[PDB]
Amino acid sequence: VPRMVVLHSLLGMAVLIAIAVLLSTDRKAINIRTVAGAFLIQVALGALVLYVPQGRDMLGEASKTISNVIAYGNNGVDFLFGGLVSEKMFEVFGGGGFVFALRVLPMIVFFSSLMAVLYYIGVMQLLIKVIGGFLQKMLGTSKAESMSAAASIFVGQTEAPLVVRPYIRRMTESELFAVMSGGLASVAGSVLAGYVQMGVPLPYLIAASFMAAPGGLLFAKLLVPETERTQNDAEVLAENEDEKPTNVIDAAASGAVTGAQIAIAVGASLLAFVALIAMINGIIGGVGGWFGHGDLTLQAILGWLFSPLAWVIGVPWSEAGIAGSLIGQKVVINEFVAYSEFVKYLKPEAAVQLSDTTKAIISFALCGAANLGSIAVLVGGLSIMAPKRRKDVARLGIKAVVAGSLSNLMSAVIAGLFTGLS
Amino acid sequence: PRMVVLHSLLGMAVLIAIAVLLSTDRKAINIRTVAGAFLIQVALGALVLYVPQGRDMLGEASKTISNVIAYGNNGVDFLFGGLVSEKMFEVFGGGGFVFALRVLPMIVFFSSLMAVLYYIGVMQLLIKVIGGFLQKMLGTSKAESMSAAASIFVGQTEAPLVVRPYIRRMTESELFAVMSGGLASVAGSVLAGYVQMGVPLPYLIAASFMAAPGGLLFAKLLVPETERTQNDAEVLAEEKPTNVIDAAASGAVTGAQIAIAVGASLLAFVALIAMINGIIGGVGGWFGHGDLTLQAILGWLFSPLAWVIGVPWSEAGIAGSLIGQKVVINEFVAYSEFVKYLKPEAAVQLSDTTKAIISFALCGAANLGSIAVLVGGLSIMAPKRRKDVARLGIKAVVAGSLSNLMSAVIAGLFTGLSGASV
Amino acid sequence: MVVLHSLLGMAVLIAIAVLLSTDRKAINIRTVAGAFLIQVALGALVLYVPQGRDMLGEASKTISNVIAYGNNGVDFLFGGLVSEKMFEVFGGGGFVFALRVLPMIVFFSSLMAVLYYIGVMQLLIKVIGGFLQKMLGTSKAESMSAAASIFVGQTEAPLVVRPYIRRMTESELFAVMSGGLASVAGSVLAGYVQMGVPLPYLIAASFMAAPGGLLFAKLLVPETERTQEKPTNVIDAAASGAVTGAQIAIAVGASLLAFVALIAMINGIIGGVGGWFGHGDLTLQAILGWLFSPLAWVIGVPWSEAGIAGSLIGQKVVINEFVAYSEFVKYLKPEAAVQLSDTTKAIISFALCGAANLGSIAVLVGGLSIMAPKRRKDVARLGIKAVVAGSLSNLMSAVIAGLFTG
């Protein structure tokens, strides 16, 4: 079994990289040290947090630490919404007692105000500089895209990294794509906690975030390798007067209001997406009713379509029909809807129970902002810092989603590998 | 009977006469447009109220929309969960119907749905057909013609898109027609919100298509066309929708700030009216009438206007309140106190011909608080016309109100013959 | 001879502010004097004089009845989720902050968008805030805002003088807010009455929050160096006011949910470091409350019951007065058997009154941020100062409490 698992996984890793090479603008310019490093660093962390006992003790400890934060986050939620989030909801409404708009969306606000404190203190600047510095010293990427890849971990496509603000205007084609892919390879800390309250495995989300930094650079440099010259740090003297908050109280409140609009936007989009798909299911169910079928849903159609891809990652074909739908929904719609239907299988009451090695894969394969919807979020926000580069960002929109998705898929193979071995 | 049939001609002549008396100029009112708009508005009336075929294709349309509305609830059930379940009625009884979670979330869904239909090109297709149909009958400019067809299933002062490149330089009559057509017609998004409240759906559908010729009926009757129509879009035209997924998300967030705004307007007005009645009820204590409320005042005040449009004087005392509350305060408060009479256990019960007239009259976003709604949303494009829009603000509210009253007269005429509603 | 225990206690609190001050040389002697006069004045009028307890008490009821019309709309918006069944299904849980308090902000923003339009509020700043301008050097409003805060909550007080907050001076800003954080709405006061706290006690601090709110505000700065799209229709004004009020709530609540959790997080820090050693259960509610125990004596219960009366005040400052009064009423019960004098229960009744905790800062920041966007920075810097100045006022009332129940 293990000799076949490491073979089924290595083959899975081979296919994913092969796709990037085929879609590469210049396969000859592919710096091996940078792409072999990005692939090695990514798979190295998998052996760190999912295999070796020393790291799993740390990953578990890290989960317990962050779980406290969330437990502290609810102390403000219990104050606000009162008993609408109590255990009395599961006695009265039972399963319906779990209000998604009150258990998940408010957590988006708190974490946004939490990191805003960490950014003001300088905690993030400490972690970004280290992780960012480590990448360029092991790969060969510029200072900008390296710091961006480290900043993309804690913050997805939501907030601008700002650590590359004086760089973005004049980055190379490959450098610009690395930033875009990084934001689509990872998720924000705010939406990360949102998945946790839904039922998504916390230790898996922690590993998935840090895997998105080298994985986000892997398929970024594969699709578009570096050809031009990286901008010098002494010649890029063009820093405009940046406005900053006053104290930690101002920062803590600024992050809350900023995360408030996010929570409202998420809940509004989800109210539409869940409803719109249900409407299409009525149309497909109607059209499918003429010949065949006519129970046919968009859930099932995306299943057979992404079934081959799901099998490549490590999910058995028998269960690829389910994993295919979830990965599909993530890319063509969003990761929130995909996660909403993934937690349905995690329930012990659920009829269809999957294997632990499969649930691990899907958890990593879904963790990512790589969808058709996050394109405009990038282009819309990235154009502010670079108004004369908006044409380049818009073109690499779909290309970055692929690089962002493949990053999640690559991290998912690593999951199915080491969790299949241990 | 014959008396009732005759009475409809009275109400029609009155509403037209008022517009002529308040017209900017009687001279060379274009007869072929005024009589043309009135002919179409009463043609569509008999086409969906008198002929079986119209009512057989309207009922099917009612089920079509209601299913889409039902589809929207699937997203609502996902968002709020058991707070909108049936257990609410087994617990909170009649209070189980949470207006903030039953009606307001529907506004979001339709705003996103139309944003999708506007992204596909379906909406622009129907506008060109209807607008093109108008410009042949009344021969008004292509700019305001499409702006009239757009104002039908579009609200929240998203006029622009047909008019956006034409607003910069148009006559005072074209600008007024847009304002009239905007207030005469309800928002295509909030129309579904009324359905969840208990408002008769088929009446809302008909009133929407009557508010387009009726919106132009009192538009070219108040201030006629006297300058030449310059129809050629300016070069200034420079883009948010990237994908259909983004278009859906962008529309949902757009609709989200609408529900909050509308929801706040209801918590405001209803509370203030009660406070006003707290004063008037106290002031009336000296005069020997502590039961005198703001509702009863507007009822006896607009009672003649109700009697003119086709409502029996016996029930006009109630209809006067609802029609008045729409114009004076807003259409939402009026409908909230209208569905109370639709209850089968109500002590008093209005006639079938009364329910129709009220529903058509109340079906309009033409209120005194909707002036700045137009002004603020129309000035952003052309700030040079801001003083022009606000000048004809109240005059447009009259045109918007007269249009809904006209559709109410046509209602009572063809709903006086059969056409009963549950 | 009780007077010296209070004459010492009123000087010590006034000392605290003279220590924590910006410009001592700027301090207007007349205004700081005039306020403490009214504070000690209004008290004896509702504590001793049984006539003022009825007047000022019915004023709070009548004005709260004006606002009570706001609830006619909350019940239309959320139906039964704010009915009585909530206390029958969730009980204590059932009352909900986000549906019973935050929506009331929309009413105020809509009501005082009409009043300014109809000049009714333009007059009350002229009369009431101009009467107390020739009484003392004010903003011609700021006193008016303090007066308003008496009958309204902390989330419904800055909305009163919001068109003035734009070009408001550094003083009047801290004046309005620190006097705004000290205020408690009246409905909360009624719940406290139901719990055990004497309505005659509560009514005193209700009117002591305005002069006390000015007493310590003007102690930091006066208005240093001598200085101090519109609605089309009234329907439009109400509407425009309503919607602006909504985003106030969204931003206020977003900050509250954040900070209450952040405070809660802070403890989970303090706890681990404490969990490392013997001490740590060591909630910040007590760490400050232990710093308050010395101060507790300076007012009140000389020994052998102060240390417990101080960690009650520490709770008010960190979390809220609801929890502070939740345990205080456990002392008022007959069976408590750690008996406190009628005057020792008078002190903790006033000290714990007011609702100017740490988490309350977030409300200030949010509400301004909608009302005066370029001012949120000038409020976060003077936020923790506002808890200090406010809570010093609540104590100033408790020294007048014991001094006039003895």
Of C287, C401, C283, C279, the closest CA to residue C352 belongs to C401
Of residues C74, C85, C242, nearest to B265 (C-beta): C242
Sign of CA dihedral C23, C29, C34, C40: positive
Chain A residues within an 8 Å CB radius of C96: 80-84
Q: How far apart are CA A223 and CA A16, in angstroms?
A: 12
Q: How far apart are CA C312 and CA C290, in angstroms?
A: 10
Compute CA C87 distance to the chain's CA centroid, rounded to the nearest angstrom.
Answer: 27
- Distance from the Cα of B245 to chain A's closest Cα (Å) equals 5
- Distance from the Cα of A221 to chain B's closest Cα (Å) equals 25
Sign of CA dihedral A177, A179, A185, A191: negative
Q: How far apart are CA C396 and CA C79, in angstroms?
A: 42
Q: Check A375 against B246: CB less than 8 A apart.
A: yes
Rg of chain A, C-alpha, whole Å: 21
* Paired tokens of B137: 């009958």
Compute CA C63 distance to the chain's CA centroid, rounded to the nearest angstrom.
Answer: 17
Residue C18: how many CB atoms within 10 A of its CB?
12
Q: How far apart are CA B308 and CA B312, in angstroms?
A: 9
Is C285 exposed, middle or buried (CB count within 10 Å of its CB: 0-12, 13-18, 19+)? buried
Q: How far apart are CA A142 and CA A235, in angstroms?
A: 14
What DSSP character marks residue A244?
-
Enumerate chain C positions whose Cβ falls within 8 A of a Cβ in A: 81, 86, 89-99, 250-251, 253-262, 264-265, 267-268, 361-362, 365-366, 369, 376-377, 380-381, 383-384
- Distance from the Cα of C66 to chain B's closest Cα (Å) equals 7
* Paired tokens of B179: 């304002």
Method used for this model? X-ray
Q: How far apart are CA A242 and CA A260, in angstroms?
A: 23
Q: How many Cα atoms occupy the beta-carbon half-sphere of B277 within 13 Å? A: 18
- Phi, psi dihedral angles at C201 (to 5 degrees): -70, -50
* Total beta-carbon pairs less than 8 A apart between chain A and chain B: 127
Q: How far apart are CA B335 and CA C265, in angstroms?
A: 47
Of A375, A329, A339, A344, the closest CA to residue A157 belongs to A375
Determine the structural domain holding residue C52 and report its residue range: 1-406
Of residues A268, A332, A373, nearest to B108 (C-beta): A268
The secondary structure element, H or E, covering residue B408 is: helix B393-414
Q: Check A255 against C251: CB less than 8 A apart.
A: no
Domains contained in chain B, number? 1
A-chain residue closest to C265, CA distance = A72
Is C343 exposed, middle or buried (CB count within 10 Å of its CB: 0-12, 13-18, 19+)? middle
Helices (H) and strands (E) in chain B, counts: 22, 0
Q: How far apart are CA C243 and CA C245, in angstroms?
A: 5
- Chain A contact probe: residue of C96, C259, C262, C358 with most A CBs at under 10 A: C262
A-chain residue closest to B116, CA distance = A276
Q: How many Cα atoms occupy the beta-carbon half-sphere of A6 within 13 Å? A: 7
The answer to whether B41 and B47 are in contact (CB under 8 A) is no
Sign of CA dihedral B190, B192, B197, B203: positive
Single-letter residue type at A335: E
Chain C residues within an 8 Å CB radius of B82: none
Of C124, C120, C166, C131, the closest CA to residue C145 belongs to C124
* In B284-351, alpha helices (H): 294-301, 303-309, 316-328, 331-336
Of residues B96, B263, B372, nearest to C80 (C-beta): B96
Q: Cα separations (Å) of B399 from B148, B218, B335, C243? A: 14, 5, 21, 26
Of residues A99, A275, A397, nearest to B109 (C-beta): A275
The CA angle C391-C30-C181, to the nearest 5 degrees, is 20
Is B353 exposed, middle or buried (CB count within 10 Å of its CB: 0-12, 13-18, 19+)? buried
- Distance from the Cα of B393 to chain A's closest Cα (Å) equals 33
* Paired tokens of A94: 């039972």
The answer to whether B219 and B400 are in contact (CB under 8 A) is no
* Total beta-carbon pairs less than 8 A apart between chain B and chain C: 134
